[PDB]
Write a protein that binds this ligand. Structure first.
Ligand SMILES: *[C@@H]1O[C@H](CO)[C@@H](O[C@@H]2O[C@H](CO)[C@@H](O[C@@H]3O[C@H](CO[C@H]4O[C@H](CO)[C@@H](O)[C@H](O)[C@@H]4O)[C@@H](O)[C@H](O[C@H]4O[C@H](CO)[C@@H](O)[C@H](O)[C@@H]4O)[C@@H]3O)[C@H](O)[C@H]2NC(C)=O)[C@H](O)[C@H]1NC(C)=O
Ligand SMILES: *[C@@H]1O[C@H](CO)[C@@H](O[C@@H]2O[C@H](CO)[C@@H](O[C@@H]3O[C@H](CO[C@H]4O[C@H](CO)[C@@H](O)[C@H](O)[C@@H]4O)[C@@H](O)[C@H](O[C@H]4O[C@H](CO)[C@@H](O)[C@H](O)[C@@H]4O)[C@@H]3O)[C@H](O)[C@H]2NC(C)=O)[C@H](O)[C@H]1NC(C)=O
Ligand SMILES: *[C@@H]1O[C@H](CO)[C@@H](O[C@@H]2O[C@H](CO)[C@@H](O[C@@H]3O[C@H](CO[C@H]4O[C@H](CO)[C@@H](O)[C@H](O)[C@@H]4O)[C@@H](O)[C@H](O[C@H]4O[C@H](CO)[C@@H](O)[C@H](O)[C@@H]4O)[C@@H]3O)[C@H](O)[C@H]2NC(C)=O)[C@H](O)[C@H]1NC(C)=O
Ligand SMILES: *[C@@H]1O[C@H](CO)[C@@H](O[C@@H]2O[C@H](CO)[C@@H](O[C@@H]3O[C@H](CO)[C@@H](O)[C@H](O)[C@@H]3O)[C@H](O)[C@H]2NC(C)=O)[C@H](O)[C@H]1NC(C)=O
Ligand SMILES: *[C@@H]1O[C@H](CO)[C@@H](O[C@@H]2O[C@H](CO)[C@@H](O[C@@H]3O[C@H](CO)[C@@H](O)[C@H](O)[C@@H]3O)[C@H](O)[C@H]2NC(C)=O)[C@H](O)[C@H]1NC(C)=O
Ligand SMILES: *[C@@H]1O[C@H](CO)[C@@H](O[C@@H]2O[C@H](CO)[C@@H](O[C@@H]3O[C@H](CO)[C@@H](O)[C@H](O)[C@@H]3O)[C@H](O)[C@H]2NC(C)=O)[C@H](O)[C@H]1NC(C)=O
Ligand SMILES: *[C@@H]1O[C@H](CO)[C@@H](O[C@@H]2O[C@H](CO)[C@@H](O)[C@H](O)[C@H]2NC(C)=O)[C@H](O)[C@H]1NC(C)=O
Ligand SMILES: *[C@@H]1O[C@H](CO)[C@@H](O[C@@H]2O[C@H](CO)[C@@H](O)[C@H](O)[C@H]2NC(C)=O)[C@H](O)[C@H]1NC(C)=O
Ligand SMILES: *[C@@H]1O[C@H](CO)[C@@H](O[C@@H]2O[C@H](CO)[C@@H](O)[C@H](O)[C@H]2NC(C)=O)[C@H](O)[C@H]1NC(C)=O
Ligand SMILES: *[C@@H]1O[C@H](CO)[C@@H](O)[C@H](O)[C@H]1NC(C)=O
Ligand SMILES: *[C@@H]1O[C@H](CO)[C@@H](O)[C@H](O)[C@H]1NC(C)=O
Ligand SMILES: *[C@@H]1O[C@H](CO)[C@@H](O)[C@H](O)[C@H]1NC(C)=O
Ligand SMILES: *[C@@H]1O[C@H](CO)[C@@H](O)[C@H](O)[C@H]1NC(C)=O
Ligand SMILES: *[C@@H]1O[C@H](CO)[C@@H](O)[C@H](O)[C@H]1NC(C)=O
Ligand SMILES: *[C@@H]1O[C@H](CO)[C@@H](O)[C@H](O)[C@H]1NC(C)=O
Ligand SMILES: *[C@@H]1O[C@H](CO)[C@@H](O)[C@H](O)[C@H]1NC(C)=O
Ligand SMILES: *[C@@H]1O[C@H](CO)[C@@H](O)[C@H](O)[C@H]1NC(C)=O
Ligand SMILES: *[C@@H]1O[C@H](CO)[C@@H](O)[C@H](O)[C@H]1NC(C)=O
Ligand SMILES: *[C@@H]1O[C@H](CO)[C@@H](O)[C@H](O)[C@H]1NC(C)=O
Ligand SMILES: *[C@@H]1O[C@H](CO)[C@@H](O)[C@H](O)[C@H]1NC(C)=O
Ligand SMILES: *[C@@H]1O[C@H](CO)[C@@H](O)[C@H](O)[C@H]1NC(C)=O
Ligand SMILES: *[C@@H]1O[C@H](CO)[C@@H](O)[C@H](O)[C@H]1NC(C)=O
Lengths: 317, 173, 317, 173, 173, 317
């Protein structure tokens, strides 16, 4: 009689299809998903310091638009800009807006030390009806609108040395008045010229009087510029009018910080990876949620699923 | 499939083997039985976990990068920003597609290999006391009760004990 | 006696050499080429809408150089620029030429709606002997050369609102006269200043009188600029002379369109992939014909051949 | 080569087998013959076509990109445009070189595997009625006419029918 | 490991075999000996050198590129320069990690294959004059002095010479 | 009795750990390092022509700062800039410094042909106490500081045709005086305007009088610009003051050349691959020494070691 001894392997009733080198569809006993394709919809507030911009662009908070006063001296790992945000101070533009945005975002701080600039000969703290702070007329909190003292605007030549261990980032601007009358009213001469300089750099700007289409009923404009002053170097503002001067400087750091456009609500939760659609788990090596990511994230790929076999070929009865 | 065992000379898997990946079925004088082989099963599982270790939970930190969506037409510099990101994504997508396809081919083959190795080890153990039927089963040419079958599964089978009985049954007319 | 049963495999007299992980030269029974390395020499006119530029750069057709009048309002998937092309109107330059080229190319249309600009106070439709249209003196078809009316050029302040659902693309320019005399002759005052503006942007340009080396015997120059005006925004041209004004706007779309430099003839044929050397088949996954491609194309690689084995190792008798 | 059949224990291929990739040659009482095995042949061919499906006709559409040739010196922005494209091309060139070399190693090995599997299946079928000569050939120890050889090629050979005859011829002095 | 010989049915390697990678140990009437097999050894070594040829001394020339370190903050254009280089380095780092892991898996497997092929070739050579003990060793059922063992290592062993003697010893009670 | 025949493989007492697809730690008999991770510390002077900048930036040598006179007409495969380098002539800036640096570096030559420019009406060869050459006051060797002749600076309009087979690269500049007095002293009128032009291009620059913080006690500045003039084209300098004129042109080539920042000493040795840390061997395919490389170099990767198995699995007794 004897006996029979058979060698075999298992199989399952619920197989999954995977791709191989030789065959785009072969059934295996089990598999695991390698592409993360969903989010909860929320930006988790840990473990990164999230700063919700709310109504303010980063730039508006930098300048000191009055609805952004809560943002003074704050820090962030990720600054989140909302699409509903809007400016509500003096209408402005920034040549190379994206570069200023990027470098502030990347520095990750709005820390501002004031400095005593020698503005003898002019009227400081100019205000306007387009930049309201508690029903009064006001201005950009970190800028200083200089006008004439007794219908006289003497030639300015103000120095500010960097004797510190770190870089100073100076934000300043140029008023472009709406009419020739306004140019005389505010500065008591025909359009000036500004020249901000250091030992390594110089930026000269020409004010240009004229009407632009009204933004919040204001046809004048301010053009914002910036200057980085290194240790042992000196800031030098030369002007004969139209200067929107700095009240001080921003510290500029390096670090992990950045900025992201998103409309996701901020949650009380912990998640290393952030996208504009919400935080995503980072167990998987790939994701197709968003090409824009921050933190320890799976790498973005075009595929929406990639099945890795974690079992043998399934061969049913 | 490259070794020829799973989806080859083993006609199909066993859905009723739920305690291991590889195993033994027998028929003898005491009835018809089944048992899992732990060592084979663990060998395949360890190797698959080795792959998973390299792929699960090994992500990389990025922080400030470049802009990848744009509200205005700009021309040159934006073309180059878009192109760089599109370039990056296609190469990573290619990497992910190739990875999965190679790993999958290799997983299917290593699982087949583990089956073939268990069959070969068993065949050697039985020496001249059995013949290969060609479908993963051995005809054992001697009385082999549950303790005997047990001794084959456990690597303790002494082939000299049954050799006389088996040779005689094997080469009879 | 018995019998003999031998197992074997085939072989061929004409083997091919392939590369492997362990050996750069092993003979297999058969192989297929994975690098496409040739073209017929022709750009196939299907399935993409090809627009042969012939004598005209895209920019010349945009502006309305007189040999490019056939190109008015045309569309393209791929605009093809020829190397023999040349300008034959008023000598011009474009700061950031490449960016204007790129964005028009990518929009894929030259569709132009005219608009009734309020140019009361000046003489429109200025002409020149360097821009000939049917033996008469003429100008860029889409631009408007404004000169004095009765030796007077009043200050211009013309508005054009975008009340549409789409962007408008405005092309305009600044005349730089050759001499001080010509500046008075054409505009009746010393060199002006132009200021084109919107709610989000402003471009001021200074004309600069002086001689440049003659191009087609003309030492004056026009500098071309552009402006995108969004829905609910308004164009505003401020000027005291030297304005080369728009007659209207171009629609700007997004899509599949682009531009390619090539001297290949256009064929009556169907081919998904286009290079500057001609169309190429796209069966293969790689090509070494050109790094510049358009359509569904094989990916460019440095290798000129890559042999994939499609058979077993060849082992002759 | 990794299984040891093609360019191993099978000394060479057969140029005169033009109707299949793998097959059988025999010598018996009725003469000397040849026949292809379709199943082995198709198994290898299907797998190679599987690779071809992934590589042939699977190209990607690109439209407006960046400029890659330049008539003027410009410095920074052009350096970066040139660098990005040079970077892209080297990584794709690397991908293509590696693909071909891995696929080729694997094709050579799968074809060798298919040969080894056909040899192993045949060896089991013959049970105790034949011995392996070490060069891909079996010495069959019984009269085996064309219908018998046919039955081995077709998977219908009944080894019990010839077992007496073969054992006797095998273990004679 | 995929063939089951090295770190499988061969329990361990031999530190005292310093003249080859693969070889033979014997016990017979004249004593206990060892010898390397050159052909197996060279087959594995050639294949590994084939890999080395593709990797050693095959570098690419680059000249003027882009700046990759910066003394000033600049914003947009520098972000894009940094991003491109970071992108390039991660993809090359990925390529190097994957290469080493695949090549290593394959080297371990080809070396195991070469061992398995030498065992299989030897098993066939011995025909019915020996049985496989399951641990890489054959019990040879006849007097086999040093010239006989030599003839097996050299591929000249004539199995018909000892067949009578071996069959008798094999199937005795 | 019979015999016993065992098949086996070797093993070693000193195994190495390698990574595989299935296991991050498996011992093999032997392995080879694929990441080059060290340098000798020296830049090998062969087989590339190395030019040690020493005290001079490439730009200083281009302009002709007096400590850089040894660099006149020299060529290089790799120009090496040192961090200790400093300027010691007239304080200057270059808008797009990086682009000029890059294009000179890449051209790989400083070959300079002088040209006889028609500067009748002015005083050539102006000097200064901030640019010392052998204790005398001097200037940038390749530039020409034009001042008034007899308190008169006539309008300049000087032509220089490129009748050659190759491009000419012209380097020129604009003086920005410190005070209004200095502007009259040097040029005998109020601030001029420069306009350098060709058939395809024009660059107009406005001088801007004013004080900048002193650099080596000098509050004035020169701003450096450049112009490429093609075959059959013509250079044209228009000016009413403030011109720092060229004495001639640089040949501009294409080739293998570049530039690297490093403080490694130059050795008498042969090495194809150069990094800022020194030359490295190129036997290995990868390196983690520096992402900045020149020559035939291993590719930079983040890993510091990658072990390739060159032997079987090691299985000790
Ligand atoms: C099909 O194939 C897959 C992959 O091979 C198998 O899924 C794995 O199964 C194991 C065991 O069931 C799981 O192990 C468990 O991991 C938990 C962590 O899960 C989270 O985090 C990981 C990433 O770190 C994510 O992958 C995952 O999605 C979760 O978000 C642990 O918390 C578990 O711990 C429990 O058991 C241990 C015992 O040691 C205790 O100490 C704990 O207290 C706790 O009770 C556990 O270790 C593993 O997560 C699964 N991996 C994946 C990728 O899904 C399937 O099992 C298999 N299917 C079949 C039918 O075989
Ligand atoms: C060596 O190895 C290669 C690859 O394995 C083999 O070449 C293949 O051979 C098959 C059969 O001969 C070919 O199949 C045919 O494809 C035609 C399409 O060809 C064009 O388009 C493809 C891409 O879509 C390109 O690859 C190709 O270059 C051509 O531009 C079909 O039109 C054919 O159809 C004919 O037969 C069918 C039968 O089902 C009928 O329905 C039709 O009416 C028609 O008569 C056919 O399907 C295949 O193109 C080849 N591939 C490649 C990549 O070249 C060699 O056969 C092999 N050599 C040897 C000696 O074995
Ligand atoms: C562990 O694994 C590694 C790799 O498999 C083995 O190392 C190789 O060993 C061989 C033989 O010992 C070496 O071959 C020799 O190469 C020399 C060149 O070396 C330099 O240049 C190469 C790149 O071109 C670099 O890789 C290397 O680091 C050196 O900078 C030759 O000069 C040698 O020539 C000598 O012998 C020949 C005989 O033909 C004579 O003609 C010459 O006159 C001269 O005497 C020789 O060819 C090889 O360099 C090693 N490769 C690597 C990558 O290191 C180990 O052998 C192995 N270990 C063990 C214990 O097996
Ligand atoms: C150049 O022309 C533009 C466009 O006409 C001039 O701007 C326009 O100026 C008037 C007022 O002077 C604005 O009228 C407004 O009407 C609303 C009614 O709802 C009223 O609430 C406001 O108080 C205001 O009076 C008009 O909107 C405005 N348009 C734009 C687009 O700005 C411009 O003033 C002219 N330039 C010069 C220098 O005069
Ligand atoms: C600054 O100098 C340049 C170069 O000398 C002046 O331009 C030159 O002007 C003359 C005419 O005024 C051009 O002469 C031409 O000669 C041909 C003969 O074939 C004739 O057909 C033309 O009608 C014309 O008279 C000369 O080519 C031209 N050269 C260049 C390079 O433009 C320029 O006018 C001077 N600037 C000022 C403001 O005067
Ligand atoms: C705008 O204000 C700046 C800063 O006060 C003025 O520059 C300064 O000018 C004085 C001389 O006029 C420099 O004094 C120096 O003192 C050292 C003593 O060690 C002496 O060796 C020098 O000969 C010199 O007299 C001072 O350093 C300098 N500071 C800077 C930062 O440049 C500038 O002149 C004012 N602008 C105008 C148009 O006056
Ligand atoms: C994550 O958010 C992005 C938003 O950008 C989604 O991608 C867009 O989806 C819309 C509509 O589904 C498409 O029309 C666009 O083509 C996408 N935009 C871009 C810029 O690619 C994406 O679908 C979201 N993903 C998840 C998982 O929620
Ligand atoms: C396709 O056209 C391009 C034209 O750019 C050819 O590439 C050039 O070939 C010339 C002469 O053979 C070389 O000197 C250049 O180095 C190449 N230029 C560039 C920019 O790379 C290419 O040979 C053509 N290919 C085919 C298949 O016709
Ligand atoms: C080669 O030189 C570079 C100098 O850039 C070294 O990399 C820097 O090392 C310092 C200190 O070890 C780190 O703080 C920096 O993060 C590195 N700088 C950059 C820009 O990455 C590198 O260590 C040197 N390598 C060798 C092998 O000598
Ligand atoms: C099969 O069914 C079980 C039990 O319901 C489930 O947990 C498992 O994940 C399923 N496996 C697959 C591969 O679908
Ligand atoms: C943000 O602005 C909206 C109106 O634009 C207002 O409803 C909301 O209360 C504001 N919130 C804050 C915190 O300013
Ligand atoms: C700079 O300030 C000085 C001193 O007040 C003055 O003489 C000069 O005119 C100013 N220049 C400009 C351009 O504002
Ligand atoms: C085999 O081993 C298992 C250990 O789990 C034991 O239950 C069984 O009794 C053993 N049988 C024999 C015959 O060795
Ligand atoms: C070999 O010859 C045939 C018949 O002429 C041909 O069609 C085939 O493509 C050739 N194969 C190779 C691999 O060269
Ligand atoms: C293009 O211009 C050339 C001369 O430059 C002329 O021969 C040809 O006829 C022109 N064709 C068209 C369509 O303008
Ligand atoms: C703009 O136009 C207005 C109104 O005609 C005029 O007062 C002003 O001078 C113009 N400005 C410029 C810069 O052209
Ligand atoms: C084997 O099968 C083929 C079917 O094509 C047939 O021609 C042949 O007669 C069969 N022979 C035997 C002996 O089964
Ligand atoms: C085996 O071959 C070697 C050749 O190196 C020789 O030394 C030995 O004597 C041979 N022995 C036999 C029995 O063939
Ligand atoms: C092992 O030791 C030898 C002899 O000292 C040495 O040359 C060899 O490189 C070592 N191998 C490994 C893998 O460490
Ligand atoms: C370089 O300058 C330093 C001082 O800055 C000096 O010690 C050295 O001698 C100089 N060498 C040359 C060649 O100019
Ligand atoms: C200007 O300088 C050069 C070089 O020092 C000299 O040879 C030349 O004669 C000078 N020219 C004039 C006009 O003074
Ligand atoms: C250019 O030179 C000419 C001729 O000397 C002169 O009439 C004109 O004013 C100059 N223009 C400038 C901007 O320097």
């Amino acid at each position: 009689p004897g006996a029979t001894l058979c060698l075999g392997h298992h199989a399952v009733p619920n197989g999954t299809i995977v791709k191989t080198i030789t065959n785009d569809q072969i059934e295996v006993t089990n598999a695991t998903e390698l592409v993360q394709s969903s989010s909860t919809g929320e930006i988790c507030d840990s473990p990164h310091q999230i700063l919700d911009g709310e109504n303010c662009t980063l730039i508006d908070a930098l300048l000191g638009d009055p609805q952004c006063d809560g943002f003074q001296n704050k820090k962030w790992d990720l600054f989140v800009e909302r699409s509903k945000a809007y400016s509500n101070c003096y209408p402005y533009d920034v040549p190379d807006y994206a570069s200023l945005r990027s470098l502030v975002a990347s520095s990750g701080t709005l820390e501002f030390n004031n400095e005593s600039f020698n503005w003898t000969g002019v009227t400081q703290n100019g205000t306007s009806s387009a930049c309201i702070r508690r029903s009064n007329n006001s201005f950009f909190s970190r800028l200083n609108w200089l006008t004439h003292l007794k219908f006289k605007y003497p030639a300015l030549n103000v120095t500010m040395p960097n004797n510190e261990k770190f870089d100073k980032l100076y934000i300043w601007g140029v008023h472009h008045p709406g009419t020739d009358n306004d140019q005389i009213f505010l500065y008591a001469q025909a359009s000036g010229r500004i020249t901000v300089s250091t030992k390594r750099s110089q930026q000269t700007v020409i004010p240009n009087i004229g009407s632009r289409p009204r933004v919040r009923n204001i046809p004048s404009r301010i053009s914002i510029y910036w200057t980085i002053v290194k240790p042992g170097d000196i800031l030098l503002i030369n002007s004969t009018g139209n200067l929107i001067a700095p009240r001080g400087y921003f510290k500029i750091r390096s670090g992990k910080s950045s900025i992201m456009r998103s409309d996701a609500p901020i949650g009380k939760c912990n998640s290393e990876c952030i996208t504009p659609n919400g935080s995503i788990p980072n167990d998987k090596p790939f994701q197709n949620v968003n090409r824009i990511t921050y933190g320890a994230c799976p790498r973005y790929v075009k595929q929406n699923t990639l099945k890795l076999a974690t079992g043998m070929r399934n061969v049913p009865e | 499939g490259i070794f020829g065992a799973i989806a080859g000379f083993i006609e199909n898997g066993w859905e009723g083997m739920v305690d291991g990946w590889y195993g033994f079925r027998h028929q003898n004088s005491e009835g018809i039985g089944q048992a899992a082989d732990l060592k084979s099963t663990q060998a395949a599982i360890d190797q698959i976990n080795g792959k998973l270790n390299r792929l699960i939970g090994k992500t990389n930190e990025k922080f400030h990068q470049i802009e990848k969506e744009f509200s205005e037409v700009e021309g040159r510099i934006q073309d180059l920003e878009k192109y760089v990101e599109d370039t990056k994504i296609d190469l990573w997508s290619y990497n992910a597609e190739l990875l999965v396809a190679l790993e999958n081919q290799h997983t299917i083959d290593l699982t087949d290999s583990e089956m073939n190795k268990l069959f070969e080890k068993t065949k050697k153990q039985l020496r001249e006391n059995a013949e290969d039927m060609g479908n993963g089963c051995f005809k054992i040419y001697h009385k082999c009760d549950n303790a005997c079958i047990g001794s084959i599964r456990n690597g303790t089978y002494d082939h000299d004990v049954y050799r006389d009985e088996a040779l005689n049954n094997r080469f009879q007319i």
